[PDB]
């Protein structure tokens, strides 16, 4: 429905620019490290993709970190994921096309109280 | 630097979904609740914004612990906006900050 158009019309059109560029997350509060469920990031780069960089987090621990700095396995670090779209530039010539692509991004981890089946 | 232009049919890995039926929003020590916005001219139509339910984190006993803070986790996401109607319809990328949930951080001086 979203990508269709009534057939009466004689390869859709992507317009240049991104709505609401002037917008950024606050990155540098060192939450990744100070979290009771801390996480690393891995930033893999693809030249035929926009954005080129996809930023994926991995939970550093199975448990959560207590106030003494020790791993508490009575709970789990579970990763939180968000859907985003990227654009792939296909072909190599005057006839260049663009295609949308869904990526699951692990944004970071939280600490969950485990429950019994 | 990278790029109207031809947009190919179909979305690569559309079928991938986030498992959101494991009640992590509740069982988290930094639990969060949800606000959702539906827009038919936006793909995906749903955007789901989380907000921390506590200032502190919940301990094993279920009491609020304010020695630590619940802090939201935001992601820079792209969504497509559908523009115009009839046979002159076009698509443009839009940036949306999505607060995906909350984690529990020991504070600093």
């Amino acid at each position, epitope marked *: 429905t979203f990508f269709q158009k009534p057939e009466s019309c004689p390869s859709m059109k992507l317009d240049i620019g991104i709505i609401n560029e002037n917008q950024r997350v606050s990155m540098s509060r060192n939450i990744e490290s100070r979290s009771t469920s801390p996480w690393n990031y891995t930033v893999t780069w693809d030249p035929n993709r926009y954005p080129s960089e996809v930023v994926q987090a991995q939970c550093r621990n199975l448990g959560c970190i207590n106030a003494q700095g020790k791993e508490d396995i009575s709970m789990n670090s579970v990763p939180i994921q968000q859907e985003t779209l990227v654009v792939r530039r296909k072909h190599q010539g005057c006839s260049v096309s663009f295609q949308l692509e869904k990526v699951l991004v692990t944004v970071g981890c939280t600490c969950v109280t485990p429950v019994i089946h | 630097t990278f790029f109207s232009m031809k947009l190919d049919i179909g979305i690569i890995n559309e079928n991938q979904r986030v498992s959101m039926s494991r009640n992590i929003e509740s069982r988290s020590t930094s639990p969060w609740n949800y606000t959702v916005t539906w827009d038919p001219n936006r793909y995906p139509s749903e955007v789901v914004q989380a907000q921390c339910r506590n200032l502190g984190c919940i301990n094993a006993q279920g009491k609020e612990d304010i*020695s630590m803070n619940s802090v*939201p986790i935001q992601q820079e996401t792209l969504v497509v906006r559908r523009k115009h109607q009839g046979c002159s319809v076009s698509f443009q990328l839009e940036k949306v900050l999505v607060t995906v949930g909350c984690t529990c951080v020991t504070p600093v001086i």
Partner: antibody, heavy 123, light 109 residues
């Protein structure tokens, strides 16, 4: 040069509404959680309300919930406390207090205080 | 709620002496307790945070101790400047930043 100045204090009648203000100056204001702590004449300290850098973390004391509304403005390096349905029990010196937490988060310990603004609730 | 009970209310000792102030919590606040000094016509000044850590600028004659429910501020070499009301504050559990009754220190002379 690193100080908090509050204002909007004075006489208000039971039921009517008042708004305290606090001009922060000489530090990065959006790097800190901010508090209102009050002191009834010849009495001890009472934490009223707190707000983190983002304004996503709002807290209120039971004595005050439903009636008072904290807010801030990182643009104007300023903090406000909308008080409504004011009672006699609210008569107090209201200090603008600055949290000692880094990254705009709550440590719930106060390093910088203002001179105070007196609020009398009387007919 | 958590209740902080300070004792004694009043206390009077001569310069060069050691004053021993007590804060008692209704339930454990672990190591999450602070000490403030309020001199007359002045806002409180943080002396100690998290039980035993002296704040920036605080002399070494001001030192704190305690754990769980039972805490102690100690001013060991009393000066005449040290006339004030001394408060304990908890950052362990909800509701946050609850304060003690206070303890007034009269510098005997």
């Amino acid at each position: 040069e690193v100080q908090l100045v509050e204002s909007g204090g004075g006489l208000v009648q039971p039921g009517r509404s008042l708004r305290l203000s606090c001009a922060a100056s000489g530090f990065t204001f959006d790097d800190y959680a901010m508090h209102w702590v009050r002191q009834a004449p010849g009495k001890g300290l009472e934490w009223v309300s707190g707000i983190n850098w983002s304004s996503g973390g709002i807290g209120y004391a039971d004595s005050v919930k439903g009636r008072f509304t904290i807010s801030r403005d990182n643009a104007k390096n300023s903090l406000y406390l909308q008080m409504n349905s004011l009672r006699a029990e609210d008569t107090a010196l209201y200090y603008c207090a600055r949290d000692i937490g880094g990254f705009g988060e709550f440590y719930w310990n106060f390093g910088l205080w203002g001179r105070g603004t007196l609020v009398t609730v009387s007919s | 709620e958590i209740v902080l009970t300070q004792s004694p209310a009043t206390l009077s000792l001569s310069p060069g002496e050691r004053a021993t102030l007590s804060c008692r919590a209704s339930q454990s606040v672990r190591s999450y307790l602070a000490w403030y000094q309020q001199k007359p016509g002045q806002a409180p000044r943080l002396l100690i945070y998290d039980a035993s850590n002296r704040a920036t600028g605080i002399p070494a004659r001001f030192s704190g101790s305690g754990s769980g429910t039972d805490f102690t501020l100690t001013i060991s070499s009393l000066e005449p400047e040290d006339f004030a009301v001394y408060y304990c504050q908890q950052r362990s559990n909800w509701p946050p930043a609850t304060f003690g009754g206070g303890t007034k220190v009269e510098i005997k002379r």
